[PDB]
Design an enzyme around this catalytic site. Sequence first.
Site, PDB file in Angstrom:
ATOM      1  N   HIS A 177       6.402  37.719 -16.014  1.00  0.00           N
ATOM      2  CA  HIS A 177       8.050  37.588 -15.652  1.00  0.00           C
ATOM      3  C   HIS A 177       8.559  37.668 -17.543  1.00  0.00           C
ATOM      4  CE1 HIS A 177       7.301  34.699 -12.377  1.00  0.00           C
ATOM      5  NE2 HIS A 177       8.747  35.959 -11.824  1.00  0.00           N
ATOM      6  N   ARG A 180      13.405  37.665 -17.351  1.00  0.00           N
ATOM      7  CA  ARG A 180      12.771  37.631 -15.754  1.00  0.00           C
ATOM      8  C   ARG A 180      12.428  39.090 -15.720  1.00  0.00           C
ATOM      9  NH1 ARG A 180      10.562  33.410 -13.265  1.00  0.00           N
ATOM     10  NH2 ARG A 180      10.047  33.833 -11.477  1.00  0.00           N
ATOM     11  N   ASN A 207       6.834  38.877  -8.962  1.00  0.00           N
ATOM     12  CA  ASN A 207       5.771  38.215  -8.340  1.00  0.00           C
ATOM     13  C   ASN A 207       6.642  37.543  -7.503  1.00  0.00           C
ATOM     14  OD1 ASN A 207       3.112  36.530  -9.088  1.00  0.00           O
ATOM     15  ND2 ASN A 207       3.937  34.431  -8.817  1.00  0.00           N
ATOM     16  N   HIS A 224       1.550  32.766 -16.659  1.00  0.00           N
ATOM     17  CA  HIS A 224       3.422  32.189 -16.771  1.00  0.00           C
ATOM     18  C   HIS A 224       3.616  31.080 -17.644  1.00  0.00           C
ATOM     19  CE1 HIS A 224       3.408  34.848 -13.720  1.00  0.00           C
ATOM     20  NE2 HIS A 224       3.140  33.923 -11.997  1.00  0.00           N
ATOM     21  N   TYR A 251       4.273  32.689  -1.168  1.00  0.00           N
ATOM     22  CA  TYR A 251       4.906  34.747  -1.393  1.00  0.00           C
ATOM     23  C   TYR A 251       4.066  35.446  -1.806  1.00  0.00           C
ATOM     24  CZ  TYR A 251       5.939  31.549  -4.980  1.00  0.00           C
ATOM     25  OH  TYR A 251       4.692  30.832  -6.149  1.00  0.00           O
ATOM     26  N   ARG A 294      -0.795  38.312  -8.431  1.00  0.00           N
ATOM     27  CA  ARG A 294      -2.176  38.783  -8.341  1.00  0.00           C
ATOM     28  C   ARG A 294      -2.986  38.561  -6.975  1.00  0.00           C
ATOM     29  NH1 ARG A 294       1.004  33.903  -9.490  1.00  0.00           N
ATOM     30  NH2 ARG A 294       1.056  32.692  -8.305  1.00  0.00           N
ATOM     31  N   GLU A 315      -0.562  28.389 -14.835  1.00  0.00           N
ATOM     32  CA  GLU A 315       0.893  27.953 -14.688  1.00  0.00           C
ATOM     33  C   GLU A 315       0.882  26.616 -16.695  1.00  0.00           C
ATOM     34  OE1 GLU A 315       4.625  28.569 -13.930  1.00  0.00           O
ATOM     35  OE2 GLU A 315       3.910  28.808 -15.972  1.00  0.00           O
ATOM     36  N   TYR A 335      14.401  28.251 -11.303  1.00  0.00           N
ATOM     37  CA  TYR A 335      14.660  28.649  -9.633  1.00  0.00           C
ATOM     38  C   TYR A 335      16.134  27.874  -9.254  1.00  0.00           C
ATOM     39  CZ  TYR A 335       9.172  28.386  -9.173  1.00  0.00           C
ATOM     40  OH  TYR A 335       8.461  29.179  -9.405  1.00  0.00           O
TER      41      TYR A 335
HETATM   42  C1  LIG Z   1       7.745  29.427 -13.794  1.00  0.00           C
HETATM   43  P1  LIG Z   1       7.253  31.113 -12.814  1.00  0.00           P
HETATM   44  O1  LIG Z   1       8.215  31.616 -12.636  1.00  0.00           O
HETATM   45  O2  LIG Z   1       6.406  31.323 -13.814  1.00  0.00           O
HETATM   46  N1  LIG Z   1       6.468  30.112 -11.584  1.00  0.00           N
HETATM   47  C2  LIG Z   1       6.002  31.776 -10.580  1.00  0.00           C
HETATM   48  C3  LIG Z   1       4.489  30.500  -9.580  1.00  0.00           C
HETATM   49  C4  LIG Z   1       4.004  31.436  -9.598  1.00  0.00           C
HETATM   50  O3  LIG Z   1       3.033  32.086  -9.878  1.00  0.00           O
HETATM   51  O4  LIG Z   1       3.245  31.747  -8.154  1.00  0.00           O
HETATM   52  C5  LIG Z   1       6.678  31.487  -9.231  1.00  0.00           C
HETATM   53  O5  LIG Z   1       7.970  31.718  -9.636  1.00  0.00           O
HETATM   54  O6  LIG Z   1       6.363  33.018  -8.758  1.00  0.00           O
HETATM   55 ZN   LIG Z   2       6.421  33.409 -14.480  1.00  0.00          ZN
END
Ligand SMILES: CP(=O)(O)N[C@@H](CC(=O)O)C(=O)O
Ligand SMILES: [Zn+2]
Lengths: 301, 301
Positions: free
Chosen positions: B12, B54, B61, B107, B155, B159, B169, B279
């Site tokens: 992102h 993003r 992702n 992240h 999802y 990675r 994170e 989100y």
């Molecule tokens: C808050 P983010 O977008 O950096 N977290 C990931 C979660 C992850 O790394 O699985 C996502 O929303 O895809």
């Molecule tokens: Zn992210």
Amino acid sequence: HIQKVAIFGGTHGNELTGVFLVKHWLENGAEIQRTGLEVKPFITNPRAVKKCTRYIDCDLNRIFDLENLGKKMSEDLPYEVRRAQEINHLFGPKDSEDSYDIIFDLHNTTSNMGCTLILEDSRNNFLIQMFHYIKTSLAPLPCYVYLIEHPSLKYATTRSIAKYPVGIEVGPQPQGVLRADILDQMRKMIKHALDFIHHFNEGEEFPPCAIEVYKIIEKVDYPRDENGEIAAIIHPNLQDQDWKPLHPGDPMFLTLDGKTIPLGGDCTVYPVFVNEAAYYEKKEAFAKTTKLTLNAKSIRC
Amino acid sequence: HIQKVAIFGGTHGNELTGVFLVKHWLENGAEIQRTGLEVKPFITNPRAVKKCTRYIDCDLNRIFDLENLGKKMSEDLPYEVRRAQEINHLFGPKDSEDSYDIIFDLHNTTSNMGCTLILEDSRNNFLIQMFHYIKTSLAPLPCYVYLIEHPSLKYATTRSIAKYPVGIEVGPQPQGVLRADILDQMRKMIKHALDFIHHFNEGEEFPPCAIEVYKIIEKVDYPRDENGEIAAIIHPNLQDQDWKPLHPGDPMFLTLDGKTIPLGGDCTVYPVFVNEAAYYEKKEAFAKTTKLTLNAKSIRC
Ligand SMILES: CP(=O)(O)N[C@@H](CC(=O)O)C(=O)O
Ligand SMILES: [Zn+2]
Ligand SMILES: CP(=O)(O)N[C@@H](CC(=O)O)C(=O)O
Ligand SMILES: [Zn+2]
């Protein structure tokens, strides 16, 4: 005597506190009405609000000047320039006696600034008395006054249309985020601002008053590498220390290698807008300011 | 034996800690090299990074699956799709023995989650051991594990290409910002992750271990209008209280008016990603997790 009042929200489309309030207020404005006072809530940048971004083609809160407001209407213009005109016509025109009396422009910042009032003119005794009133009402909840009048700097805000421009800033808050505590602080700020107008409109007399303000001196960019990429970040001792003094010895920035770049210069300063997301593209890590006092003469409707 | 290790930043593009490290490490890997172990840093979404958004067309992702990775390559495809395949071809193919062994994906989150590890497989003894090592090594600084394994939800992450995918994170940090204290936290997480790999590769035996994790149950949207606009926001008690237990009677959302909307149900839950900027569009105010314990069998190289 104060007649025409507006509250602008969504000047920046990803600053959701203002947008949320104004959009509720458009549906039910009881909170922002007083006895014999009509205030109009209004969405400044509806398109940026729809895309939840700060702006579409350029920053709206920078273009309310002759260069931009004097252009010929045209579908080829940047969206914000067209929109600035529409706002000038609706709530101004600017520099006219027909303009609105007071415009509150609502903003959010990622900087740890708390409740903040923007002052565009040091001489205006009406504002100094309003700001004194709000400051004091809010306490011991703190509230600071950023004074942006300056020769070369200072930018043509959305609220500069009115005779009495007021910026309302609350942080820290992430862009795209609605935090309750921030929402509450912004409501309390407005509550007092509108109360003051009403109080003044029922012919109360306010004695002379002093307030402390923070006057812009200059704006500091991130130390940058040989290609224009950021080569150092806000030192953690400076992170979240908006308003607090910073002396020539003190740490400003920090490199990935752990190297600390100190302030330098000649005197103490008070940093503002420390690490504001939207100012990265403006090359502003933070703004240097001096603390000084402003005195107001008593006033009466 | 672990040979091929990658660190992804900029998945992102507005999550800058990952981007800022990875760009530095691309210019000097010293920090992320270990003796007998080569680690390749990589920028996954260079284009979203340019715009500090993003993503361009869709969330990178979420698309590393058969549907997208099996598609015929063309310029009608979303950028991120075209980009995902290009990443599969460099660090996978996913589900092949020729894939990379470990990928760390970096992240940032606006939520107040602290140091956080994403576990994609509840039966993976190796990861569970790594996580326990990082947890233990970071102490007393907390470290939390979010198990996104689930039949329907869960999802296709960048990675997930690797045999051993690891999500790192760190929050809270506003999008589009670089905090030093958050940067330092991510570096330490990585230091200890690489140390673990190295130690394992030098034959050290690891006894069995247990870690607390938080398993996704269901995601919860903000309560909405008949127009689908947000009608209530994250209650002050719930705000910033990621990981901490939420009981059935407890405040959850707040209206302007403002009425409290409590949790409801009869089981305690552990909320994660409370008030994550990214989100809002995904229609998730927060994720309800249940907190359970996982065991690793001992392991050895
Ligand atoms: C808050 P983010 O977008 O950096 N977290 C990931 C979660 C992850 O790394 O699985 C996502 O929303 O895809
Ligand atoms: Zn992210
Ligand atoms: C970080 P922000 O956009 O809420 N601050 C204002 C400052 C102001 O209201 O003058 C601006 O940059 O336009
Ligand atoms: Zn703003």
